[PDB]
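Usage example:
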Amino acid sequence: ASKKGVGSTKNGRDSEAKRLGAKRADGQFVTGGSILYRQRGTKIYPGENVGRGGDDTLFAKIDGTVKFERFGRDRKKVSVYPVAQ
RNA sequence: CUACAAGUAGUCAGAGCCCGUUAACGGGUGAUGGCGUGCCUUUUGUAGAAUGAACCGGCGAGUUACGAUCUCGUGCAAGGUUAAGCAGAAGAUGCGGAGCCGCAGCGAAAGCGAGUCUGAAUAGGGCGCAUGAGUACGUGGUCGUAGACCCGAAACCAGGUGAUCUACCCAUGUCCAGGGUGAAGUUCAGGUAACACUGAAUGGAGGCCCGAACCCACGCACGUUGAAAAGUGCGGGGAUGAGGUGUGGGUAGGGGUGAAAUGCCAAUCGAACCUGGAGAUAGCUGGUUCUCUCCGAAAUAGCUUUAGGGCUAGCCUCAAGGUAAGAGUCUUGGAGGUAGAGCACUGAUUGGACUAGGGGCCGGUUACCGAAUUCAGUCAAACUCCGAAUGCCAAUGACUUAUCCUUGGGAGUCAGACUGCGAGUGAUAAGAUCCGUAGUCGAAAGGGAAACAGCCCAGACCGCCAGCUAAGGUCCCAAAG
RNA sequence: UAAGGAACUCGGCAAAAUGACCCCGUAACUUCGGGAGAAGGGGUGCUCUGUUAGGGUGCAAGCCCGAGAGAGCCGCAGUGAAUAGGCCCAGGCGACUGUUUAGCAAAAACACAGGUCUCUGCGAAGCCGUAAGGCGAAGUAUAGGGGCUGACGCCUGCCCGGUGCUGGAAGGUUAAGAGGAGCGCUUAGCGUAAGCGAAGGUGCGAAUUGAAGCCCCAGUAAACGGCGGCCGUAACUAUAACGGUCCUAAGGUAGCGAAAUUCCUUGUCGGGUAAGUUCCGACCCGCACGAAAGGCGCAACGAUCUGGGCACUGUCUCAACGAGAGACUCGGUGAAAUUAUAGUACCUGUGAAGAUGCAGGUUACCCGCGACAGGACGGAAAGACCCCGUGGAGCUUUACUGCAGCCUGAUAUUGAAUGUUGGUAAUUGACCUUCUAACCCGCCGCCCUUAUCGGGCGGGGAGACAGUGUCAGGUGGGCAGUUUGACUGGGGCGGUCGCCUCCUAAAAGGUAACGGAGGCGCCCAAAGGUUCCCUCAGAAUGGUUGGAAAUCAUUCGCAGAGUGUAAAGGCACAAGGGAGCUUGACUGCGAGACCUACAAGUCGAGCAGGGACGAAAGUCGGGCUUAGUGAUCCGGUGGUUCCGCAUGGAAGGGCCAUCGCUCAACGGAUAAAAGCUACCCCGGGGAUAACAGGCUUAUCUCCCCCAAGAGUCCACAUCGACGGGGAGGUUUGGCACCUCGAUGUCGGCUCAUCGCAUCCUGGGGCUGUAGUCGGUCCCAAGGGUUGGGCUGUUCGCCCAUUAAAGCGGUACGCGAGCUGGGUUCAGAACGUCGUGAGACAGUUCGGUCCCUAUCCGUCGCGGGCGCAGGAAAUUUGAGAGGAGCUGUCCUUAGUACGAGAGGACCGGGAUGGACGCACCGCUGGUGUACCAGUUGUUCUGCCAAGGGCAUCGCUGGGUAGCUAUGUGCGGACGGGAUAAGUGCUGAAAGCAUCUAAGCAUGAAGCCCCCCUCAAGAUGAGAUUUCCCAUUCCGCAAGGAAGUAAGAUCCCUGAAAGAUGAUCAGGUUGAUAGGUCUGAGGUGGAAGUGUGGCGACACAUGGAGCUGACAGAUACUAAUCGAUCGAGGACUUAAC
RNA sequence: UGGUGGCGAUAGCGAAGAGGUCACACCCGUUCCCAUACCGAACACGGAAGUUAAGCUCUUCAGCGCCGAUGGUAGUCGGGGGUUUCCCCCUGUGAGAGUAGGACGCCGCCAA
RNA sequence: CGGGAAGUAGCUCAGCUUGGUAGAGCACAUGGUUUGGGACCAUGGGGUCGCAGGUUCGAAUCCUGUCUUCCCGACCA
RNA sequence: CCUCCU
Ligand SMILES: [K+]
Ligand SMILES: [K+]
Ligand SMILES: [K+]
Ligand SMILES: [K+]
Ligand SMILES: [K+]
Ligand SMILES: [K+]
Ligand SMILES: [K+]
Ligand SMILES: [K+]
Ligand SMILES: [K+]
Ligand SMILES: [K+]
Ligand SMILES: [K+]
Ligand SMILES: [K+]
Ligand SMILES: [K+]
Ligand SMILES: [K+]
Ligand SMILES: [K+]
Ligand SMILES: [K+]
Ligand SMILES: [K+]
Ligand SMILES: [K+]
Ligand SMILES: [K+]
Ligand SMILES: [K+]
Ligand SMILES: [K+]
Ligand SMILES: [K+]
Ligand SMILES: [K+]
Ligand SMILES: [Mg+2]
Ligand SMILES: [Mg+2]
Ligand SMILES: [Mg+2]
Ligand SMILES: [Mg+2]
Ligand SMILES: [Mg+2]
Ligand SMILES: [Mg+2]
Ligand SMILES: [Mg+2]
Ligand SMILES: [Mg+2]
Ligand SMILES: [Mg+2]
Ligand SMILES: [Mg+2]
Ligand SMILES: [Mg+2]
Ligand SMILES: [Mg+2]
Ligand SMILES: [Mg+2]
Ligand SMILES: [Mg+2]
Ligand SMILES: [Mg+2]
Ligand SMILES: [Mg+2]
Ligand SMILES: [Mg+2]
Ligand SMILES: [Mg+2]
Ligand SMILES: [Mg+2]
Ligand SMILES: [Mg+2]
Ligand SMILES: [Mg+2]
Ligand SMILES: [Mg+2]
Ligand SMILES: [Mg+2]
Ligand SMILES: [Mg+2]
Ligand SMILES: [Mg+2]
Ligand SMILES: [Mg+2]
Ligand SMILES: [Mg+2]
Ligand SMILES: [Mg+2]
Ligand SMILES: [Mg+2]
Ligand SMILES: [Mg+2]
Ligand SMILES: [Mg+2]
Ligand SMILES: [Mg+2]
Ligand SMILES: [Mg+2]
Ligand SMILES: [Mg+2]
Ligand SMILES: [Mg+2]
Ligand SMILES: [Mg+2]
Ligand SMILES: [Mg+2]
Ligand SMILES: [Mg+2]
Ligand SMILES: [Mg+2]
Ligand SMILES: [Mg+2]
Ligand SMILES: [Mg+2]
Ligand SMILES: [Mg+2]
Ligand SMILES: [Mg+2]
Ligand SMILES: [Mg+2]
Ligand SMILES: [Mg+2]
Ligand SMILES: [Mg+2]
Ligand SMILES: [Mg+2]
Ligand SMILES: [Mg+2]
Ligand SMILES: [Mg+2]
Ligand SMILES: [Mg+2]
Ligand SMILES: [Mg+2]
Ligand SMILES: [Mg+2]
Ligand SMILES: [Mg+2]
Ligand SMILES: [Mg+2]
Ligand SMILES: [Mg+2]
Ligand SMILES: [Mg+2]
Ligand SMILES: [Mg+2]
Ligand SMILES: [Mg+2]
Ligand SMILES: [Mg+2]
Ligand SMILES: [Mg+2]
Ligand SMILES: [Mg+2]
Ligand SMILES: [Mg+2]
Ligand SMILES: [Mg+2]
Ligand SMILES: [Mg+2]
Ligand SMILES: [Mg+2]
Ligand SMILES: [Mg+2]
Ligand SMILES: [Mg+2]
Ligand SMILES: [Mg+2]
Ligand SMILES: [Mg+2]
Ligand SMILES: [Mg+2]
Ligand SMILES: [Mg+2]
Ligand SMILES: [Mg+2]
Ligand SMILES: [Mg+2]
Ligand SMILES: [Mg+2]
Ligand SMILES: [Mg+2]
Ligand SMILES: [Mg+2]
Ligand SMILES: [Mg+2]
Ligand SMILES: [Mg+2]
Ligand SMILES: [Mg+2]
Ligand SMILES: [Mg+2]
Ligand SMILES: [Mg+2]
Ligand SMILES: [Mg+2]
Ligand SMILES: [Mg+2]
Ligand SMILES: [Mg+2]
Ligand SMILES: [Mg+2]
Ligand SMILES: [Mg+2]
Ligand SMILES: [Mg+2]
Ligand SMILES: [Mg+2]
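Running the assembly step on the lines above writes:
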């Protein structure tokens, strides 16, 4: 039984998935430090009491409630507001 | 009971006949009717045209020791406990405190100590304390070291036994009916100056010829649970030789011997045989024995000289805790770029208008192509000016439901299958392959789809000669139009 | 064994033929021997002459051997039986006789004589052994060992670059051992401390010295090996003697060549054949010949291989008969493999995808006996193939690591002199030479001593060498232990392996494939930090050089740019551009998060220390973000309020910092690793390949749609592009679902059976159908469908036929049916590849084919019971099987048709081929209890006549029976209904219209007709005839007994037969034997006579003899017996 | 008017007008602080002769851009069916495009 | 079918690996030399690197595709 | 080194 020779692919590579995106929900309580969003670039901007890390990670600078919110016409931010106290 | 019957041999229904018991809504037999593809192993899936068992009987597989750890029990408890040994029934027990564990941790260590280490630090942080139980013994679960659940290699090494078979050799014997051919040499004759050379006779060479014994083994047939573990029959080859054969001897296994085939070395040879190391090792195959109950998987991820193995995680179970932390639905908020769609970007692309420019044809002209621009029009996994349904993450109560988490003991699983839906690979093939998602099978019997793991309906604790329905059905087989 | 004679087959395998002696005669070729038993022919008994000639023995007598003749005699035949070469032509291979895989290979393999290379000066080399001791060899270069080649003949070219071997040693490099310049630790002592530091001890240690080897220089190919491209060129073309150029150590000479080598390939041409994939001869595009792994020849030789002839034949056409051994029946004895239990049908389907057992149907009374193998994926053997195992073993090597051996140095044993030449002016190393006294002697004499051992003594030789010990370097598949990855739509081979980005990815996250695309293993001292300022691509227009595009100016300008680098996400309050100052490209950390099996990975506000920039606010722990990397162990370097084995130190460790991995197979097995196995083995797998099956149908085969064209015209007679749609499931595949505790695998043979897509024959439509022929389509599966050459072949080509030479399925139908050529083990060889061991759907020569049938199934044959009494016959036919083919000639008619050429339908008739049934009168075959001839020997005493054995001894005939090649006969003639087709009438639809109502016609096909079986046809049928209603038990229901008609046991047998069965008979009986008479067969008995010297001939006499054949005849045997076998249920209806 | 904010361009472009004592500009200088990879252009320091031409402020406008329903349609969760590369049905949900329409600014605080 | 290697002037070859320059021999052309050829001497010219696309400021050179011509492989069944 | 044919 004859078997035709076959070629090869020059593809077959991919990097590890980086588990990007939202890490806390709108309206969820977070502690200071909590990563809110992982991203390349600013898909979402740091709002009130939120920071942008060296790799564009958005994180809560205080304890409080996460609010994702429209930032002008085209953009989005995420903010953390203190609880009513 | 049985000669018109289609048989995993029963089971349920059932006359007839024959009986009469541990006296029971009894026993034997069984015309006929319905249903019904053994058991085990291994599998995605086995009635399997895969595996195992002729039958019956007996025998035949998680053990024990010493350590570790957990649960349970008991004694004592900030303590607990003795070992060897001595005495004593091979005993209990008494003595024996050496030793061991615990009561304090932190640090690599010096060391400090309810703290300590890091650090320049009264900082912060790590591990501890505060947040207190151990220890001795026993049973049980599991682990470790031992053959460690049982059976099974091919092999490896050590020490031996074999050349009464066979290989070659050594010493010493012996065998080979018959027939043929006619080398050298010699003689004689011829022959020449001598020799050459010629003829005839003689002579008896030879891994010479034909052919019995003997040895061999070329062809065919037969035989193939044989007359025979290599033969017989008919033919065949050698048959004075590198011959056959007897007796007595020699060479021995990491070795001999080989006119060389890895041949032969006692029916064994790519390394003999026997015993031992030895219960070698086997991530492999097979097997692993009483019952019922409660619960009940996986066939995945990651890493692996890894891919049919393993480990951690996932999923199961048991206990103790926490406890109500889980889940469904409604409501509310949010992240996100798929389906669709669109052309705003990138790329592809059709027609018209339009010409820069190029090409045929004279700085001049053409049915030849044309960039841009413009009008209209198509398309896209790696296009997006847009953008759902769902799914996901949460919050908030409400209505409902009972899960959920932690710690510890014990696993198994890492071959999956098909079906529907969304993709890739393929040829928009495969009962194909590879993901995603739901189901069923696996591990699920019952009804339907003739039969038919995976489809449709539906989850078997038992009994009933009750009833209602599901899918699918209602002329007869075959319940109901 | 008729006729034939290789047609058989892979192949003349097997068989047949040949065969003794004497004589004649005998070719090519040759190594002059051979070839040769070449070939091809002739003779062959017996009698007499004849106790021949002649010979041996002997005094003779005699005995023995014995040609060659002549004359006869007999037979079918005289080596009368048994035993006893077939031969020839040509080629390959090996020169030859030998040898070999005990037990699948006898060969082309091995050996061989011969050649050559090479080593070896004798304690030889080589080999065995640790050594002693040995072999070598009681040999000595004309000898011995090793490698290669393989008689003989002619020959044996080129390359020394590589590798090996040999020689060389000027230099380089290199060990132990010498050597000890320095340095460290320690501490007497000295120092307020810090430090310094004598001596000693101790730990390191540089220069220098140091052999062989290696590098290096040469040589060597009958050492290992190797021995080229491209382009141009001649006055026809073609080809290029000739030239150019690149490369090499050198480019393959002679010879041979489609080959044991040639893929393409059945090369081409010639020969041989009717036909030749093989064979021989040529040619040369030598895939991939080639000169001692020899080249080319070659007489002789071969159980060698190949091709062709003569002879010969049962090899075959195509089979028939006979003998014996089994088989079969009876008596005796009596295993085995296998086995889940089996009351064990068929079809189609289903299903783990190929069912006795499942479904639905169809069929089937119960039990055997002889037979056959289709199935039980039959038995046998835990598949040798293939894969897998971090399983083995054997083998290889420039795999790794070792070891033996060998070489080389140092040092000990080991001493004495002499010069010479290096540090050190007198002391120590190196070197050369000499000595003798160690050591050695496989030298001599003497002694122990009857001794080729050993020892002693004395000579001689050699000599501080050698040998040996220790240490060291080199060499070293000679030997040893091992390694030699995984993924993978089987494995190998190719590719890949970690990290980053995108898509696939189904709008969270995640998500596979040997899916689709790309990047990375860095870079930057600014391309980092901060402060301040800024805006890009491109276009248009103007303008020196200057263009399409340099720099300048204006205008337009969400970015069409840029962002170190891939991509994505981002970025114009810039994250893009510019400038100033800087080093936060910080140290200690770090609430809390993300990610996650772990190990790791990511983000982080904030705190402290000390800074950079900024007036300040503030920002800064590298870079727009996301790659740019690697665990542990081990080791190095720096630091250190740590440890420091009595103490002080130190050595060494710890801790912090940091360095060394294409550990890239990137979670890294080791510091250190490649191959072959067809000599292979074990554990496993249908988890995974090869055969067959299944799914699929790309490919394949077939059929269609559209209709552009072709066809003068004309798409559609015929063909049909571009495109489109299917069917089938015979191809190659894809997939990997059954089977690896075995599903034997190509072709052929034997036996078929099915489909129809039809090859022929039958029936038709259309035709570019005049006729005869055809083309094309439709119906049709009844029957039929050849023998050869070549090749293992399927296929194909060819020869010759034929009505035709169909295509497919059935596990590529059929190996428990056969074969075994091929494929597919072990041997050997060629080309080729490989350093090698070895390897090749390349080739070549050779190479073990097991099984007693249980079940179903198939073919035959019995027994049982049934079929409302028991019997004997004859039957109907539900139903089943069989058969089913076709040519040629004559005639119609040279008619129809046609210019002619040619030449029919339809219809008559005759006769064949192939096939089948029966049968032996005919022709033949066979004919083992028939007749005859004949050889040898042996027996019946001898002669004569006979018997036995030699294949039935052989040879010539042959009866019955059984038989084909022999004879006879068959498929005839028709009905019925139909297919395609043709219609008639006829409307729907005023017409038309084969159809809707109605009515026909019409195939080798369907149902009959013809032949056979058939009532288990459980639906058990019918007709005719026979027996006759018994007895006893019983309430009857039943039961028992003896019988009738009839049958059987037993017996004689054959027309029957494995056995049963069947049939003819069983005494008023011709059943068989015998007997008698015949037929046929043989061919002329014995005895006697006559003739002849005799072998023999003739007569008596178509005699004698004669299995199975015919008739007759109770002479013999079928004796006497016994056994079995009805008394007929009930109901209803008509009588 | 000026400053300074918040709100998705409904705020923007573009077009046509109107306005300036003060305020905001342009404007006029380079002695000084400071400045230009050259340039007092800009930045900086100073001034007030001029001017609303431009910026700025205020009107008007729907050409471009922006915002944008309702209905319908595509798609689709769930449930069924079929002639199954795909399609249909039913209770939900529901775009994009297109369009009606909106829109040439809305809301602060301070100073004058 | 799978894997390689080439492709540069008329012909044969370098250059490619390292991006910036198109070389070399023979041939060709012109002159000289010769009675005339040949040889010899002197002096010149000739591609845009197979084709297409890409990366780059820039491609014979780096990347891809394609075409042509060679070479190797196609094993176990 | 060569020197077309008659
Ligand atoms: K039953
Ligand atoms: K099996
Ligand atoms: K602390
Ligand atoms: K306790
Ligand atoms: K155990
Ligand atoms: K051996
Ligand atoms: K699925
Ligand atoms: K041999
Ligand atoms: K032949
Ligand atoms: K021969
Ligand atoms: K099965
Ligand atoms: K059978
Ligand atoms: K496959
Ligand atoms: K690895
Ligand atoms: K098969
Ligand atoms: K069709
Ligand atoms: K198998
Ligand atoms: K067989
Ligand atoms: K069989
Ligand atoms: K059976
Ligand atoms: K006859
Ligand atoms: K009957
Ligand atoms: K007579
Ligand atoms: Mg095949
Ligand atoms: Mg960074
Ligand atoms: Mg019946
Ligand atoms: Mg019955
Ligand atoms: Mg059935
Ligand atoms: Mg399976
Ligand atoms: Mg098994
Ligand atoms: Mg069994
Ligand atoms: Mg060993
Ligand atoms: Mg012995
Ligand atoms: Mg002996
Ligand atoms: Mg002889
Ligand atoms: Mg002989
Ligand atoms: Mg014999
Ligand atoms: Mg043996
Ligand atoms: Mg052991
Ligand atoms: Mg449960
Ligand atoms: Mg394994
Ligand atoms: Mg686990
Ligand atoms: Mg779409
Ligand atoms: Mg799966
Ligand atoms: Mg599948
Ligand atoms: Mg399972
Ligand atoms: Mg079920
Ligand atoms: Mg059922
Ligand atoms: Mg099951
Ligand atoms: Mg009913
Ligand atoms: Mg004959
Ligand atoms: Mg004859
Ligand atoms: Mg033949
Ligand atoms: Mg034949
Ligand atoms: Mg023969
Ligand atoms: Mg020979
Ligand atoms: Mg011989
Ligand atoms: Mg043998
Ligand atoms: Mg032998
Ligand atoms: Mg043999
Ligand atoms: Mg010796
Ligand atoms: Mg000797
Ligand atoms: Mg040889
Ligand atoms: Mg030879
Ligand atoms: Mg030579
Ligand atoms: Mg050769
Ligand atoms: Mg040679
Ligand atoms: Mg089943
Ligand atoms: Mg099926
Ligand atoms: Mg079936
Ligand atoms: Mg079975
Ligand atoms: Mg079997
Ligand atoms: Mg079986
Ligand atoms: Mg096996
Ligand atoms: Mg084998
Ligand atoms: Mg080895
Ligand atoms: Mg070992
Ligand atoms: Mg593998
Ligand atoms: Mg593969
Ligand atoms: Mg590879
Ligand atoms: Mg999703
Ligand atoms: Mg996602
Ligand atoms: Mg280690
Ligand atoms: Mg000390
Ligand atoms: Mg790895
Ligand atoms: Mg590893
Ligand atoms: Mg071999
Ligand atoms: Mg061998
Ligand atoms: Mg095996
Ligand atoms: Mg399978
Ligand atoms: Mg197959
Ligand atoms: Mg099968
Ligand atoms: Mg699969
Ligand atoms: Mg089996
Ligand atoms: Mg047909
Ligand atoms: Mg096939
Ligand atoms: Mg077959
Ligand atoms: Mg068979
Ligand atoms: Mg064979
Ligand atoms: Mg070679
Ligand atoms: Mg092979
Ligand atoms: Mg080959
Ligand atoms: Mg009938
Ligand atoms: Mg007769
Ligand atoms: Mg006859
Ligand atoms: Mg006589
Ligand atoms: Mg006798
Ligand atoms: Mg005798
Ligand atoms: Mg009857
Ligand atoms: Mg008689
Ligand atoms: Mg809308």
